[PDB]
Amino acid sequence: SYDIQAWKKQCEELLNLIFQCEDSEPFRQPVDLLEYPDYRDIIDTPMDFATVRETLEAGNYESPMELCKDVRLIFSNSKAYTPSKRSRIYSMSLRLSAFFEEHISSVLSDYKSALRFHKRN
Numbered sequence: 001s002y003d004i005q006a007w008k009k010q011c012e013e014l015l016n017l018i019f020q021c022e023d024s025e026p027f028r029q030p031v032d033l034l035e036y037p038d039y040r041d042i043i044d045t046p047m048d049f050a051t052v053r054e055t056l057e058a059g060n061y062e063s064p065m066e067l068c069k070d071v072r073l074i075f076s077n078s079k080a081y082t083p084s085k086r087s088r089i090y091s092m093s094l095r096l097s098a099f100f101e102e103h104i105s106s107v108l109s110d111y112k113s114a115l116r117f118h119k120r121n
């Protein structure tokens with residue numbers, strides 16, 4: 001599996017699966033500050049799944065590592081903002097993070113393998 005470009009459709013399919021998960025609904029769009037007035041006091045760099053999908057479709061990721069860094073930021077923002085490790089929305093973040101890590105592992109491995117094959121000689 002040495003296709004250097006295959007990660008992009010694989011990440012599109014994984015984002016589609018994430019958009020079918022009920023657990024993703026809080027993380028699809030930005031935080032309304034009328035509902036969470038302190039959000040930008042606590043969080044430096046907002047990220048949501050619609051921003052990741054748009055960045056991908058714009059051709060503004062060079063690698064699946066860059067996409068993975070932005071998805072992990074969604075989850076670290078939730079852990080940072082949560083007032084409790086027993087919150088509803090933080091709990092949804094942890095399930096969705098486990099699902100995402102289970103599926104992104106092969107996408108990263110296959111891409112890095114393809115890049116090593118490209119430089120083999």
Ligand SMILES: NCCNC(=O)N1CCN(C(=O)c2ccco2)CC1
Nearest residue numbers: 026029030031078081082087089090
């Ligand atoms: N359409 C919803 C847009 N997003 C949104 O309102 N939130 C998701 C991100 N947040 C959290 O990760 C979090 C952790 C504990 C409580 O909230 C704040 C709320």
